[PDB]
Design a protein around this ligand. Sequence first.
Ligand SMILES: C[C@@H](O)CN1CCN(CC(=O)O)CCN(CC(=O)O)CCN(CC(=O)O)CC1
Ligand SMILES: C[C@@H](O)CN1CCN(CC(=O)O)CCN(CC(=O)O)CCN(CC(=O)O)CC1
Ligand SMILES: C[C@@H](O)CN1CCN(CC(=O)O)CCN(CC(=O)O)CCN(CC(=O)O)CC1
Ligand SMILES: CCCCCCCC/C=C/CCCCCCCC(=O)OC[C@@H](O)CO
Ligand SMILES: CCCCCCCC/C=C/CCCCCCCC(=O)OC[C@@H](O)CO
Ligand SMILES: CCCCCCCC/C=C\CCCCCCCC(=O)OC[C@@H](O)CO
Ligand SMILES: CCCCCCCC/C=C\CCCCCCCC(=O)OC[C@@H](O)CO
Ligand SMILES: CCCCCCCC/C=C\CCCCCCCC(=O)OC[C@@H](O)CO
Ligand SMILES: CCCCCCCC/C=C\CCCCCCCC(=O)OC[C@@H](O)CO
Ligand SMILES: CCCCCCCC/C=C\CCCCCCCC(=O)O
Ligand SMILES: [Gd]
Ligand SMILES: [Zn+2]
Length: 283
Amino acid sequence: EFEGRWRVIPHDVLPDWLKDNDFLLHGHRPPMPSFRACFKSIFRIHTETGNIWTHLLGCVFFLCLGIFYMFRPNISFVAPLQEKVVFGLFFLGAILCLSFSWLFHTVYCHSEGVSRLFSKLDYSGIALLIMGSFVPWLYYSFYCNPQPCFIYLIVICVLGIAAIIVSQWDMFATPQYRGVRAGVFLGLGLSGIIPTLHYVISEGFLKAATIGQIGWLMLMASLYITGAALYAARIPERFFPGKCDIWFHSHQLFHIFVVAGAFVHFHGVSNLQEFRFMIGGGC
Ligand SMILES: C[C@@H](O)CN1CCN(CC(=O)O)CCN(CC(=O)O)CCN(CC(=O)O)CC1
Ligand SMILES: C[C@@H](O)CN1CCN(CC(=O)O)CCN(CC(=O)O)CCN(CC(=O)O)CC1
Ligand SMILES: C[C@@H](O)CN1CCN(CC(=O)O)CCN(CC(=O)O)CCN(CC(=O)O)CC1
Ligand SMILES: CCCCCCCC/C=C/CCCCCCCC(=O)OC[C@@H](O)CO
Ligand SMILES: CCCCCCCC/C=C/CCCCCCCC(=O)OC[C@@H](O)CO
Ligand SMILES: CCCCCCCC/C=C\CCCCCCCC(=O)OC[C@@H](O)CO
Ligand SMILES: CCCCCCCC/C=C\CCCCCCCC(=O)OC[C@@H](O)CO
Ligand SMILES: CCCCCCCC/C=C\CCCCCCCC(=O)OC[C@@H](O)CO
Ligand SMILES: CCCCCCCC/C=C\CCCCCCCC(=O)OC[C@@H](O)CO
Ligand SMILES: CCCCCCCC/C=C\CCCCCCCC(=O)O
Ligand SMILES: [Gd]
Ligand SMILES: [Zn+2]
């Protein structure tokens, strides 16, 4: 098309608001204050191609998975309205996170102001992913006891809202604060260790590891700590500058870790429900 033609550019030519990873040396999209060109650029090769498509493709996937769940027969659930509301909040959190992300990774190169607004929606989406993922997990983990279930819900929501308020600070988006983000969100998700200690302290290592939770929760902490480590350390683009530029750089692998992470997490709480059903609502 002879409308909105652009070329990829090296890092040095990017304005300071687009310059974020000095290991992605070429393949950058230039500032294009046209969302027409921005959304058309989804069908182009560049540093954000994979970022766009992993969370764009992953967003339609959670959208389908969250629609199909809503239309599940109500005999499957002990309390289908309640049980569907808890999963619903996880699914919305998963959908919003991926949407804010693929939208931001798309309209990113548009302007400084636009990238500034959508990056704050992008960060905020991570916090809503963690918050929402806790809701069905606490519903089944603290099923027969609601004093911790209520407290831990407020704890994850008070922490998540703080993370979301800290995401509005413009320093938080700078590449000097990259480690601070990987710690802020990593801390948010790892704070689940509080209710894990508490659950284990009252059910015991038998009632906790027999029911898969311990084996699953560890893999989840692996995905969380390995994943955040990649983002903050910029691996592998640190070891192969200008070679891992279009495919397989850290932000791209991190997207895969987020979609995979939210799938492992869904399959986990979709087991706590398959189990709570095989036992009914007894206390
Ligand atoms: C003559 C080349 O310098 C032109 N070529 C540059 C890229 N490489 C090599 C390089 O990086 O210099 C050539 C390989 N090429 C097609 C093929 O190999 O058949 C892929 C498409 N590219 C995209 C682009 O760069 O805009 C078209 C322009
Ligand atoms: C300049 C861009 O318009 C090229 N662009 C499309 C065509 N290429 C070329 C190929 O087919 O070999 C595909 C693979 N390519 C290798 C390479 O070109 O170095 C990746 C890196 N290039 C950066 C660069 O070209 O300097 C970005 C991709
Ligand atoms: C001043 C800097 O420390 C912070 N600033 C970036 C400055 N750029 C400079 C450039 O990169 O050319 C100007 C672009 N523009 C504003 C304008 O129209 O002057 C966007 C809004 N600004 C507001 C401001 O200018 O303070 C946001 C942050
Ligand atoms: C959660 C998903 C939400 C939907 C995301 C968007 C999907 C559809 C995308 C549409 C892109 C259409 C192009 C939008 C083009 C408008 C911007 C533009 O360049 O305007 C120029 C002038 O009007 C001003 O100078
Ligand atoms: C559209 C409403 C359908 C209602 C079905 C009612 C029965 C309950 C359904 C349970 C889940 C069935 C398996 C479907 C599980 C979701 C997978 C999905 O949709 O992935 C999206 C990708 O294929 C595309 O990117
Ligand atoms: C889908 C994204 C996740 C966030 C929630 C979105 C809000 C959904 C709002 C309204 C949906 C109205 C219809 C809701 C339909 C759910 C009940 C249903 O059909 O169960 C199958 C049973 O009939 C079998 O016994
Ligand atoms: C922010 C997201 C919150 C969740 C929104 C979606 C909630 C799910 C919607 C409807 C579930 C209704 C379950 C109600 C089950 C009642 C029993 C019945 O008679 O079932 C017949 C069914 O066909 C009725 O659905
Ligand atoms: C983006 C999403 C962010 C997280 C939103 C958090 C909202 C929390 C509020 C309500 C969650 C659904 C509660 C649904 C109502 C629960 C009532 C109940 O009987 O609870 C006892 C159970 O624990 C065991 O049976
Ligand atoms: C996005 C949600 C991800 C999952 C939910 C929250 C994640 C919580 C974070 C970390 C929990 C990791 C648990 C790792 C295991 C700790 C429990 C423990 O001490 O078990 C004793 C047994 O090993 C004895 O055999
Ligand atoms: C959902 C289950 C876990 C999935 C993997 C999560 C990885 C660890 C979480 C946070 C650390 C990375 C912080 C990224 C902040 C900037 C957001 C971005 O643009 O990607
Ligand atoms: Gd400015
Ligand atoms: Zn991202």
